């Protein structure tokens, strides 16, 4: 018999939960989670040179634009997925119901 | 530049990221934290438009 007693302490560790990874897919709009950093975007090969210490990159604003892959240590840029407004060009419904 | 920067503020919330609020807290407390962020972001948009 083996008894596994789990001590509940205030210490910072709480470490054993396993983390299951997926494969890395680039150049597509995907959801992602990199070491707890989450978001939606398109991951592409980056030309940025992170120091061995650095893990994430940011813009002049705090929007994240790059990550270090935790297994390959490759730096990837995060491009927002395409988004924009839609305008409808209508001749008017008293003329035609064709729109652009 | 200011309006985007406002997305990083907490306005009294636990965190500026909606996904962290939803992942750490139960639904009704998360809703309170989200309303705190909604109020801050909406006020930021009203300021920008004015």
């Amino acid at each position: 018999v083996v008894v596994l007693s789990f001590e509940l302490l205030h210490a910072p560790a709480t470490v054993c939960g396993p983390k299951k990874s997926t494969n890395l897919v680039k150049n597509k709009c995907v959801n992602f989670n990199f070491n707890g950093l989450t978001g939606t975007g398109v991951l592409t090969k980056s030309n940025k040179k992170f120091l061995p210490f650095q893990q994430f990159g940011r813009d002049i604003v705090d929007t994240t634009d790059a990550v270090r892959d935790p297994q390959t240590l490759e730096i990837l840029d995060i491009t927002p997925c395409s988004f924009g407004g839609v305008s409808v060009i209508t001749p008017g419904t008293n003329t035609s119901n064709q729109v652009a | 530049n200011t309006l985007v920067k406002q997305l990083s503020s907490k306005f009294g919330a636990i965190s500026s990221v909606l996904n962290d609020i939803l992942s750490r807290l139960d639904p009704p407390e998360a809703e309170v934290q989200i309303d705190r962020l909604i109020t801050g972001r909406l006020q930021s948009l009203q300021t920008y438009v004015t």
Binding site: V61, P80, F83, G84, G85 | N1, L3, V4
Partner: peptide, 29 residues
């Protein structure tokens, strides 16, 4: 002779004042 038929003064004015949504692309366009 210019790619855009602007006057020398207009070309200066355009050079002196400074589809990829490079900036503030967080719902803002």
């Amino acid at each position: 002779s210019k790619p855009s038929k602007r006057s020398p003064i207009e070309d200066l004015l355009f050079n002196k004042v400074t589809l990829i949504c490079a900036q503030k692309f967080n719902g803002l366009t």
